[PDB]
Amino acid sequence: CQPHNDFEASRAGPFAAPKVPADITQGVDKEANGSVRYSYGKQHGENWAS
Amino acid sequence: GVGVSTGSYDNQTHYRFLGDGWVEITALATRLVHLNMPKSENYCRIRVHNTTDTSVKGNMAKDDAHEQIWTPWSLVDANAWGVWLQPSDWQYICNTMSQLNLVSLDQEIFNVVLKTVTEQDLGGQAIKIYNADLTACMMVAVDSNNILPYTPAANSMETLGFYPWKPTIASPYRYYFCVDRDLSVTYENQEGTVEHNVMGTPKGMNSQFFTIENTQQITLLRTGDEFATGTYYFDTNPVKLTHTWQTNRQLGQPPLLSTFPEADTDAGTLTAQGSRHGTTQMGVNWVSEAIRTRPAQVGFCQPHNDFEASRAGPFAAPKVPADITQGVDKEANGSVRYSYGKQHGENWASHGPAPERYTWDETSFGSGRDTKDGFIQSAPLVVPPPLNGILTNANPIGTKNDIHFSNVFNSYGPLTAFSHPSPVYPQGQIWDKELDLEHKPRLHITAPFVCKNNAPGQMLVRLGPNLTDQYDPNGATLSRIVTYGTFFWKGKLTMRAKLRANTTWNPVYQVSAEDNGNSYMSVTKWLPTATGNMQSVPLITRPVARNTY
Amino acid sequence: TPKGMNSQFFTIENTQQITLLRTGDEFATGTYYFDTNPVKLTHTWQTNRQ
């Protein structure tokens, strides 16, 4: 079990404490299991038509 | 050809003193095995889902929901401490040796016997006649590659016989399969029936189906044949055979004594707590045996009964066992409780479906926890503990009067230091295969020894199917001749170990056998009865004291 | 504000040997070797239950 969204703050400022990704199971808990979400561009993989 | 033995019986234990404090201990064990023709002609994917308990709102832990794959093969897994050494031997080892590790291990199968049984009416009845079948043959296979799911015989408490002069049956083989099980949470009598509680269907990304027929070289052997495996070597590390008493309280230099006891009654004193040298992690201007900094952290608070759920379903999150201390917190410290049978150690006189059980308590007095004393205080640490500036094991955390910080606190930090789980002589798991993961656990609770290299390789075995005169697969007619088998097993578990020396003045605690009485260490406990019944009770592991600093 | 105990200021001009190359020139680096461990290309279905 990993702390769901444990925002820890430091001298640099508040941040999201990383968490080892894992299966989502039937719980459909994505953000809870650490399922990373990406955001790329056109020169990185997005359709040039969009 | 056939009609002659192919092996020798030997179930002893020799001690070869290699000097320099180290001694090579070779444990030989031979037993008679009894195998019956498996009922399942082929691999089955039986799905067991108990609802007699899961349906109830109160019952949550009694979730035996899973889908295993029953194979037509048995298994000769003698991974038990009591199936190798002798009751008396273990006493000598624990009392002398201070550490032990596994070295080699071999196996052999001689005097393979296969007979068939037929019905024969006698005076109107029907007695069974037993005729030996030479042409009959069995099948053996040692998956040293571990291509098949590792199935510890101790995890199901179905190893071989701990009694030399008594036969034993090989436990069937079966492994878990991919199935998405889900169970909702319900307390006592929650509003409405349990939300979700259903089994799952086979997935294509986790469908693990194996066959003994295509995962190992099956060696066919008859009555005159015999099998033997190579000398497997263990790479596991040695486990200390001593307990730790020193707690986080006693480590470095004790406080300087300012007063000396005049009588054996009174005691001495320390120096001014406010004016005394030392190191404390508090900004206060005083020190004590409770705030003084220590080299590390001995033991750690573990979440009491932290049931974590996954795609497979809810389960009890394992926890490293430790001393129970004066808190008498067994289930809180992780004191594992066992349940063995008669062929495993229970008295043969206690007739009944109720097996013997015992709760094993660790000997690591140093890493012992006590829920009846754990507490926290506000950042501004002050001598007088405010009513709101402290969290004792009596403050309802989470709108619950029984759920405190202790039940949900993990004090595991970079300073966490603990010992290993003392292996029990009876029904104790020796070695175990490591998990195929990038970051495997620092240790295993099931077995002290963990094969760093490859695993030993479970030994599978199945009786050769004796077909009848008539046969037709398409007609679902699997006519098989009633046949069974009885083969002997011979194994030698060589392992070296070092013995400690008397470096103290006061005699250290030992394991003795008091006279026949209420005393737990009673001799009758390991002595036959008028009828011949016997029982094997756990032994005191790590009797000698060990200084942890 | 900038601290004196954590002031990390670097310059590409004083942290590496800059190789000047024109149109007819060309650069190439040595054969770097990795010491990283191999990563399994398979998933695990077995849970604490089985």
Side-chain angles (χ1 to χ4, degrees), chain B residues 177-234:
Chain B
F177 183 64
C178 171
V179 272
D180 309 310
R181 189 276 184 294
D182 193 300
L183 170 61
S184 294
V185 288
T186 44
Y187 63 106
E188 191 60 62
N189 302 298
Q190 187 172 62
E191 307 304 299
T193 182
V194 188
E195 306 299 298
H196 300 64
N197 187 304
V198 293
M199 201 56 109
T201 62
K203 295 203 67 181
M205 298 185 89
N206 312 302
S207 181
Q208 290 288 60
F209 175 56
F210 305 113
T211 58
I212 319 301
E213 322 297 297
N214 310 59
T215 58
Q216 186 65 201
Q217 303 182 299
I218 317 302
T219 58
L220 266 175
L221 62 165
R222 296 190 172 182
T223 311
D225 296 294
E226 60 80 54
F227 184 64
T229 182
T231 313
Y232 173 70
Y233 299 123
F234 294 71

Side-chain angles (χ1 to χ4, degrees), chain C residues 6-20:
Chain C
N6 312 302
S7 181
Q8 290 288 60
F9 175 56
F10 305 113
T11 58
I12 319 301
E13 322 297 297
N14 310 59
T15 58
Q16 186 66 201
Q17 303 182 299
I18 317 302
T19 58
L20 266 175

Side-chain angles (χ1 to χ4, degrees), chain B residues 367-424:
Chain B
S367 59
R369 304 293 79 177
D370 202 303
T371 59
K372 305 177 186 181
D373 292 294
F375 70 109
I376 312 91
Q377 183 173 53
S378 183
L381 192 144
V382 292
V383 184
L387 209 293
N388 293 297
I390 182 170
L391 184 64
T392 63
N393 202 309
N395 307 296
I397 303 175
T399 68
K400 296 300 165 63
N401 308 63
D402 288 61
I403 302 298
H404 309 72
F405 70 112
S406 297
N407 294 187
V408 289
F409 192 59
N410 191 57
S411 185
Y412 185 68
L415 305 161
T416 299
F418 54 106
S419 292
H420 235 60
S422 301
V424 293

Side-chain angles (χ1 to χ4, degrees), chain A residues 1-2 20 22-29 33, chain B residues 180-182 198-200 306 308-312:
Chain A
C1 301
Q2 307 181 61
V20 290
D23 183 51
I24 311 178
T25 333
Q26 300 178 300
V28 198
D29 299 291
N33 279 300
Chain B
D180 309 310
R181 189 276 184 294
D182 193 300
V198 293
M199 201 56 109
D306 172 48
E308 304 181 6
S310 186
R311 176 160 283 210

